[PDB]
Homo-oligomer: A and B are copies of this chain.
């Protein structure tokens, strides 16, 4: 069993060849059973197929365990056979492989995350954890999550795997349709940006499409990650012959694409549905011995939900309204667990032009940890947009970052060591970006004092390798309370000039009659100084219409 350092070393030296399909091979041998059941019922057939790929030149084979998790096996009455199904698979693959690499293969459960299905993050996590435990015990050289269709389920899988073993090489794949989107709406850039920063070793694509159609999708993925890359196309577009779906792309037509994947930085090439030992033999000849190509990723500041990637290259409206402060009806409905009221609020803000939603749960001691976990997982699917997680308890913060389906914005660390460190460390583990609020030991009054917090923040962020994952909040103070908003505008201009995104808690300025007018005037002024987002009320039609006018006037849209 090789660890991820050894596998990464090997990959850095040469492009490796994976294996082909298993189901279609088993069928040609007269076995139409659920593939995973053959590990118990006909281990000889599984061994023969592995050996046919080893003899065809594969450097890596996948264990016969695509469907071997409790949640998937339960659908076939096999839940109680998880342990022997998986141990047998690994032993059988190791027997075939000798010195070649054996990767534990895990596919998705077929269950959609709540609220599309019934399953919460923690249930998927435990499901994947149990299979990974068996595989690591049995001595796999790596774990590959093949054919995932949803980012929250894949996030659970990779986090569970890494929890079991910090040492195992981990590969995460999504499968994309012809429009370049997963089942729940994720495009390759979103997949790459969300997963590049998790502690996986490689990203990749398999299934759904043939080698030609995967090319531009793979290219997009390759542009946004510097990690190892893997591809396993189906053997062309499926056709039906005598009422069965067949993947008819022949070895040469398939193999001729290898150079194009090599040019995009591929590290491991194999095949999915319809790929046979004949294909792999040719791939072995065509690939040969190649050192992988170097690439440099494109870097952007973006946050995501399953279906939406929001890049801060334009003014971002962050809806403030899911926040029960001074909202008696929302507060009461949150305390009891009303989800529908939160969903309606989320959807209305989006309808009015919010691109990200801030989500805050008032007095957090009064709120059900499970309600939080539920709403966090739910809103990105139903409202379509990413969230700004506005959470104070470090503990609830962890639960929310875990269950968050995409790459979130995390609403706020002040410039304080203990606080920045805990929050940077959670975001490093679970993914995400951070709003850094420019205050600490005291609330600053002047531009100069804010500048000092900015530079102090930059120091801390540089030392934690986190400078590229922050937006700064200069700290809007109430007008009535000597807020000195000119000092905030000066700060916006300054940070903006340094290349960093900014945001404000806009409504805090006018905490007054005619607040809509103070908020509107400040936002216009802030945008003219470079303000790149704001946490604000999208239901304020004066504010939103004057915002649109401002962007039009300034040639931003």
Contact = CB atoms under 8 A, between A and B. Distances in A.
Interface of A: 479, 485-486, 489, 514, 517-518, 520-522, 524-525, 528, 542, 545-546, 548-550, 552-555
A3 to B, nearest CB: 57
Tell me the interface secondary structure of chain A in the complex. Answer: helix
A19 to B, nearest CB: 59
A195 to B, nearest CB: 40
Contacts of A548: 514, 517
A554 B524 CA distance: 12
A555 B447 CA distance: 15
A555 B487 CA distance: 11
Contacts of A522: 549, 553
A520 B547 CA distance: 10
Contacts of A546: 517, 520-521, 542, 546
Nearest to A542: B542
Contacts of A553: 479, 485-486, 489, 518, 521-522, 525
Contact of A479 (B479, B521, B525, B552): B552
18 contacts: A479-B552, A486-B554, A489-B553, A514-B545, A514-B548, A514-B549, A517-B546, A518-B553, A520-B520, A520-B546, A521-B524, A521-B546, A521-B550, A522-B553, A525-B554, A528-B528, A542-B542, A542-B546
A508 to B, nearest CB: 14
Contact of A549 (B520, B552, B554): B520
Contacts of A514: 545, 548-549
A122 to B, nearest CB: 47
A549 B542 CA distance: 14
A485 B514 CA distance: 27
A548 B489 CA distance: 17
A545 to B, nearest CB: 4
Nearest to A550: B521
Nearest to A519: B549
A435 to B, nearest CB: 23
B555 A486 contact: yes
Lowest 7 A-B CB distances belong to which pairs? A521-B549, A517-B545, A521-B550, A524-B524, A517-B549, A518-B549, A517-B546
Contacts of A554: 486, 525
Nearest to A524: B524
Contacts of A479: 552-553
A154 to B, nearest CB: 43
A59 B479 CA distance: 63
A489 to B, nearest CB: 8
Q: Which of A517, A553, A555 has the most CB of B within 10 A?
A: A553
Q: Counting chain B CB atoms within 10 Å of each CB, which of A521, A552, A555 scores highest?
A: A521
Contacts of A517: 542, 545-546, 548-549
A445 to B, nearest CB: 13
Contacts of A524: 520-521, 524-525, 550
Contacts of A555: 486
A457 B278 CA distance: 84
Contacts of A525: 524, 528, 550, 553-554
Contacts of A485: 553
Contacts of A542: 517, 542, 546
A547 to B, nearest CB: 8
A517 to B, nearest CB: 4
